[PDB]
Write a protein that binds this ligand. Sequence first.
Ligand SMILES: Nc1ncnc2c1ncn2[C@@H]1O[C@H](COP(=O)(O)OP(=O)(O)OP(=O)(O)O)[C@@H](O)[C@H]1O
Ligand SMILES: Nc1ncnc2c1ncn2[C@@H]1O[C@H](COP(=O)(O)OP(=O)(O)O)[C@@H](O)[C@H]1O
Ligand SMILES: Nc1ncnc2c1ncn2[C@@H]1O[C@H](COP(=O)(O)OP(=O)(O)O)[C@@H](O)[C@H]1O
Ligand SMILES: Nc1ncnc2c1ncn2[C@@H]1O[C@H](COP(=O)(O)OP(=O)(O)O)[C@@H](O)[C@H]1O
Ligand SMILES: [Mg+2]
Lengths: 97, 1544, 281
Amino acid sequence: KELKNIHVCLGGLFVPEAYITATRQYVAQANSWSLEELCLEVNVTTSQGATLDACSFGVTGLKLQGATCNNNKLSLSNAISTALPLTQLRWVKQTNT
Amino acid sequence: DVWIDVQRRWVYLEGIFTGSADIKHLLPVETQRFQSISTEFLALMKKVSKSPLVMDVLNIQGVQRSLERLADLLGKIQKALGEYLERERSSFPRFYFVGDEDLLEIIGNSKNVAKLQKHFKKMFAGVSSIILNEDNSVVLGISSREGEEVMFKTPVSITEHPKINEWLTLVEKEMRVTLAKLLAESVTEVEIFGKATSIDPNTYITWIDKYQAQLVVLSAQIAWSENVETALSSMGGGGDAAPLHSVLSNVEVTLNVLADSVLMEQPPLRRRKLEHLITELVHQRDVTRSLIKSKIDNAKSFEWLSQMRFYFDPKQTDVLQQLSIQMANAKFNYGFEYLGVQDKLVQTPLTDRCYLTMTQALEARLGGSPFGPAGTGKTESVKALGHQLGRFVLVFNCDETFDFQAMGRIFVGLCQVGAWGCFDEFNRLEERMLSAVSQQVQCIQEALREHSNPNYDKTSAPITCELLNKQVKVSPDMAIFITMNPGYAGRSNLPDNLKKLFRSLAMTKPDRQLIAQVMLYSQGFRTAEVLANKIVPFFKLCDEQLSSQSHYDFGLRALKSVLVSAGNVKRERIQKIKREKEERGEAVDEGEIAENLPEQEILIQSVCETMVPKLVAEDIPLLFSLLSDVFPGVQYHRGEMTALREELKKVCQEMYLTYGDGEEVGGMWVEKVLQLYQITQINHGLMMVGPSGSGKSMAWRVLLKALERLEGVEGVAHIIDPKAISKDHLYGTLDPNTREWTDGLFTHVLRKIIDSVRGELQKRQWIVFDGDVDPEWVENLNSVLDDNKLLTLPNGERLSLPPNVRIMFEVQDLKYATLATVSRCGMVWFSEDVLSTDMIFNNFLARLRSIPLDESPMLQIQRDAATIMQPYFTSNGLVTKALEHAFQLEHIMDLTRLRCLGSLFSMLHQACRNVAQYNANHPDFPMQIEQLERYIQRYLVYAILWSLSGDSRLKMRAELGEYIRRITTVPLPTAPNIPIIDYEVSISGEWSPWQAKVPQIEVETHKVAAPDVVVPTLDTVRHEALLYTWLAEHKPLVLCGPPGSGKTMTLFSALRALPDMEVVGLNFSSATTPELLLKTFDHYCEYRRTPNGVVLAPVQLGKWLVLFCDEINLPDMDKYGTQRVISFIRQMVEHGGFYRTSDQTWVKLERIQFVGACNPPTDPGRKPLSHRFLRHVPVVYVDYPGPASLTQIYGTFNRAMLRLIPSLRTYAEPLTAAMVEFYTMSQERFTQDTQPHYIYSPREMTRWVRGIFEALRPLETLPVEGLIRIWAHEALRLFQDRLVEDEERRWTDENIDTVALKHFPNIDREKAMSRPILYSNWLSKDYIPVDQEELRDYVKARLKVFYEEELDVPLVLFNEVLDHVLRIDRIFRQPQGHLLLIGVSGAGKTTLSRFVAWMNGLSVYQIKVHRKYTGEDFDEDLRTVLRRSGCKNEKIAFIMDESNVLDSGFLERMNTLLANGEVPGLFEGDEYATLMTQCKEGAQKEGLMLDSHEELYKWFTSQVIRNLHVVFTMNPSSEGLKDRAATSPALFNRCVLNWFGDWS
Amino acid sequence: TSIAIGSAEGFNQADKAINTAVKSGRWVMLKNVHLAPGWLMQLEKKLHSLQPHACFRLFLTMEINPKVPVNLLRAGRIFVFEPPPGVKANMLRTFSSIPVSRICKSPNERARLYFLLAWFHAIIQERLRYAPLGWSKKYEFGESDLRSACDTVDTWLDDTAKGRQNISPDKIPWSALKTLMAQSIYGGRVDNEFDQRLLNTFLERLFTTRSFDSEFKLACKVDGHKDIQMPDGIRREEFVQWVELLPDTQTPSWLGLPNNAERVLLTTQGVDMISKMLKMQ
Ligand SMILES: Nc1ncnc2c1ncn2[C@@H]1O[C@H](COP(=O)(O)OP(=O)(O)OP(=O)(O)O)[C@@H](O)[C@H]1O
Ligand SMILES: Nc1ncnc2c1ncn2[C@@H]1O[C@H](COP(=O)(O)OP(=O)(O)O)[C@@H](O)[C@H]1O
Ligand SMILES: Nc1ncnc2c1ncn2[C@@H]1O[C@H](COP(=O)(O)OP(=O)(O)O)[C@@H](O)[C@H]1O
Ligand SMILES: Nc1ncnc2c1ncn2[C@@H]1O[C@H](COP(=O)(O)OP(=O)(O)O)[C@@H](O)[C@H]1O
Ligand SMILES: [Mg+2]
């Protein structure tokens, strides 16, 4: 259970694309859903001021190129890259809306 | 030079004119001319055969004059035949797809059409045969492979047009016309089916059964296009109520009828028609929805123009032009070519995008180039578009041999017929060949562009592009397509001028979700959308989560494999249910069966049958978690193939294997065999990946026999090692001059199966490629492993893979294979855990208890012996625990489980033979069970020690011995300190130390340091017995160790105890190829045709040939990590034979074994041997003798040498210490890290003792100071000559003084170590020391004579020159004394060698290298030298320079010459006889009588060794020397290296 | 006479064509001569000891690779072909290559379409310099794409306007052009979803009925608050004149990229000039 609450750096993993699948599997297994009907929602918050629910996974080290994220909203900027403090990957059911 | 050409020309022309008895009806004038030529040939044979003498016929006049006339006549008629072939090819251009020999077969067999039925496959798209009446004079129609047939409206007879071409023209015209007329009727019926609220299933199915699979789909497309066009025309007013909803409604109701039809059982032909109609109508439904959603109300809107529209004009007089297919602004006319029943493709958006881009390119009169990763759908989309427009699409698997001439004839064939060419793997061509082809493609395109101009008229001259210096008519339907995978290994770069000729298109992400949904929907799967939305994300997650393995492939091909397997499983499950419904009760309802069918369970079963077998052990839990997560609540249990399992039990028992079910021993292997069977059913291309010794070969061998006894179909397997032969020998070669195709190995095997003279299609044929896989050779099988199931050759020939042939590969890894090959073959992964160690132990014991060793008292000994080792051969037993610990030690080569076990079993086999020999030697008292128990138990520990630690240093041999002593219960030697490796097991059954087998011998004085004299030591006696055990079993072995350690000496010493073995020396280099072994086989062995096949055995009957490869790991690895000769040797060891490329016949070796020698793989220039080759060969590590051993070895040599002078006998002990100490210091001080040639070994010590012995031989008495001077002089000539830097020479000079003074305290230093140490036998008869001033005056006088008689260039004499001429003179006075002079050019290396050679009477020979010098000239120069120095007994100093090496072949022949003294392949053919005549004549002059050729060659070799001296001069390059240390290893261990360098 | 080098017969044709041309006076071109570096040395020796006709010319198209013999390079005049330095230079090259009679045809709106094609081709091609940002990989957006695009414009404009002197901007088949350019001509080389998304953005922004208005902006916020304005001309000469009057102050904001996309590249090239100036001292 503790392994869920740790924030990993996707750049520091040998296969970062496997982590996304692993989190996708964990959420579906916990809620008894299906893998093919889960979509990804991203919520950018501060590292210290963040809460992780049963479906949110923390990711650090993501860099936003040419844009700044304020209140989970992007705005064009002249900076080469802006470091996102903490990214919460939340898995929710597909809505097809 | 004229008789042979005329003889050959007459031979094949006679066969052409005799095989084709009807060729005279079409070739009247030349038939009479040939009859006159035939009369002349008969007259020639009636005159020349009377006198069987060349002299009797050369004097007859009128022979050469008539021969020239015959040659002109033969050429003229041959040209006329060639002009006739092209003229006949001009009419009915489909003849461009048949070969010239095949075309004459059609020409001469016009009377009988039965022989013509086998060629219609390769002139027509889907016409496999023609239907004829009972009279075989009227062609009623045509037929396809699937059985579908087309009946001509007006049948084409052959009587009205016997001309094969004319009536072959009419059937092609009739097929197009009758297909146009049938389509016109079909569209009329489907128009009634259209614009209707409801469709009756009975009427719809009848119409489907009435027309061909090509016409039903086309009729549906035409009806829908007209309905939408009419609906759009009515809606053209804008803002009107939409009747387009009716068009969508009409499609949906027709889809419902089709969807219910596939649910019930249908005939296979109707079912394919049902599937094609569903696939198209689904596309029509999607398009109509898109039109409705976008509110398209104009027939000219691009949302409708971009879609493919079909227009039918019944008012058109020409039925061929009745149908027009339009996409965007591109307009095409249906070709009406009979395509048979092809597999349609779900029209996914990417396929549509592909259709738009390709059709845009065709309108622009340039080809299309779809590119992307493999599996996307490039070739199929190109083929589908061609089949959509009714074109003839030819698929060619391009590769490097598709040269300019080969492609031109293909383009000529396409242009005349008007076909489509899909050149897959176009970038696999050479870059220069890609550039040259761009000219032909440009010429064709420009001709097409002028064809499309409205000014041109059909009446005006037809557009003709220039192809291959000829005017070739270009049909407007001609097209080029080139699929390609950029970035893949083995692929070239397309030049920019060629790339601008094609409209590229990225085919990277196929729409997997749509392809599946439609495929499942057309197969009768209810809720196909649910399954598609589950199976496509599953494959995406598998690609991400699963580990990255070289044999993994989860692309479209894998999804397709699953979907096709899903359809097969559902049909089988329905049949199984139906068979249950007939036995239990009698109620059968197809509607109910399809209703309660576990479709998800079927899909999982297909996934487990296809995806699971290739999974590694760590990845199986991940995939099964994905299956349970993606498909929750459903589980699948694999069916127990009990029918096959019993057959596996019988085959495994009869081949001494271990069988198990589930978790029992051998259980995992059986599941792998069963998985292999399932892959065979659904895939025609297989691979068995997994580490060496994982049971792969036993898996498919047992499966082949189990299937043979189960299904009753005989199994035939052709095992081919692809990398053991060149690619030309594997697939074939095309002659660049005569354009004649010589079949390769694989092509000959596949062609033989297709022809089936001996009923080949009735047997299960498995072509196994047991070898390494790289994109160089395996991509030629891309079209074979693809659906095309076609093998395309550069000569245009295409061979279809028969349904009973499976292409299988047995590989250990796929780290070099590209994704194209990986995705084309079902993968079965054999991990090392599959074949457990207990599994191998049971196999060895079962074979030991059953197969007698001699060919019974032998078998009884084996059975008693096997029971004794039985407790030690169990899980967690003595052997298994020792094997596990042996993996933790350090070995000179990589350790594999099967190599250790293979060595161990051979030793235990020798133990049983030892027992029988004891019984034979003691007939009255056979060895009892107690003595046998003690002997076997002790020998087992002895065999274990020498098998698991034979290839490790002394420390690891002791470590394994200490570990064994802790765990065994067998009685062991009780010595507190002596390791167990020091003991042998006597035949009586007790441990005996090896020290008892080593005596302190006294070598004879005249045999000091002789090549065949070995002083026995502990290491010598241990390895001699070890090699005896392996050599007596005829198992190949490899000796590993540093050069000079004694690998060759030990083997020859061991072979002396075997009088039935003759050793043949082979010297491998970096350029070594299997040709070197083949040349040895020709000289020493012969081919004979036994009833069981061709057998290669040595000429000497009763003697075993031992091929000793001197440097087995030196041959260069290609860019894919494979040594061709090693793969060749591995084939002849594992399979006991090789393939003769002359006629592609398997040659089985008899009475031949191999012995290998090599430096450790860590040495520079040495490559590690493959694990599949090391499995068969035990490795024994022969290390340098220790200081104690060196003192014993050369203390005996020194004692024998010093017996010449009794006064010096007391200095034998200190002298040996001096040589050993100085040699050790020089070995430590100078290493191979500094210079490549800094190699010091006991060979230097042997040369040291021989050097001192030769100096002391003639001298009667010599003081101690004299002996030190000789000792010091020999040290300088051995350790100082090769030194590079001056500081190193000073180090040697100083330490020589220090070493001599340390061990010889009371000597006269100035008398014994005066610095100008010079020795020469020039001033006097003996090899006494000489003064520098006296030597200089002597050389001055001799140089003056040298100028008068020889080279007249003056020389300036200095101290270095006097030293150098003395060193060169030393080498010239030795047998097989070759020199390697390294120094800056112009330093006098050649002029000194010539001077010294003239001094010693040697004849100087230098090769006259010019610009046109090649390999043939060098061989002639070599053979001249060998003939002079081997037959005429003339001493020759062969002087050769580095600049004289124009090729790697030059060094290879010199490499063999330096070490062996003879090149095995140098004298072959007629000249071998002349050499034997001179060798016999030369032997007669000497005084020896020799009769057999075997003894004459040995005398010739001995003469060349004694006489020929090779002087090699080269510049002192840093990297050049390192390269020369590998390409010509004999330059650094057979030649004395002298570093002249620059002038000081 | 154009001959593709690389085959044995190609060498014989090259020798025959040169021998015929030096006396007759025609032209001979040899393509991809860098694939036969050994034969090039023989060609250079043959050319040196030769006095051909006055009008004879020999062209050797090649790729810039070190395998080309040094002697051949010294004996001939070298021309380096590469993508034009800037948007202004790229448009000028496009207009010069296209024949004047092709642009000025029956519909007066054809000239504007070629200008948009020239601008679109320039913007697409000069985003390749900033390869990680402007695209995702070095696509070969070349002259062949422009020729196919011009043919598509010619084909569909003639189809819609049957010889009429003027065609309404709304009647121009914008969807026909936009779809073909994004799926067949320029979209064929695009192998990525996001690159295809970017390509669709440019085509939809440019090829629209509002491109014929006087207030159309080719680019926005190039520097400060100024933006590139669509020319108000209707003839080919007017558009070429507008290109020649470009400010010669091109920044990545012309292509839509941020102005700092060239900061790294210009720093590296500026440093490289120092090393080049230092290596020949
Ligand atoms: N079912 C079995 N029962 C007992 N022994 C077996 C069984 N299967 C294989 N073996 C033994 O294991 C070894 C398998 O050799 P095989 O050539 O089949 O393996 P492989 O992995 O194909 O080898 P390579 O990779 O070198 O081609 C042999 O010693 C064989 O006798
Ligand atoms: N649109 C499609 N619908 C169904 N199967 C397809 C489609 N496109 C490709 N395939 C399948 O893909 C497999 C590989 O063919 P393809 O991808 O064309 O090979 P390649 O990549 O070598 O050109 C075949 O089984 C083929 O039927
Ligand atoms: N026990 C021994 N008795 C006599 N000579 C030995 C002994 N061990 C090594 N030598 C000497 O070492 C040399 C071994 O060289 P060789 O076996 O040809 O090396 P390699 O096999 O590595 O080419 C021989 O010349 C031999 O004189
Ligand atoms: N010791 C020497 N004194 C004078 N001239 C020399 C001497 N050694 C070499 N030469 C010159 O070098 C020439 C021959 O060079 P050669 O021996 O063929 O060079 P390499 O040793 O590289 O083969 C002769 O013409 C001779 O004049
Ligand atoms: Mg095997």
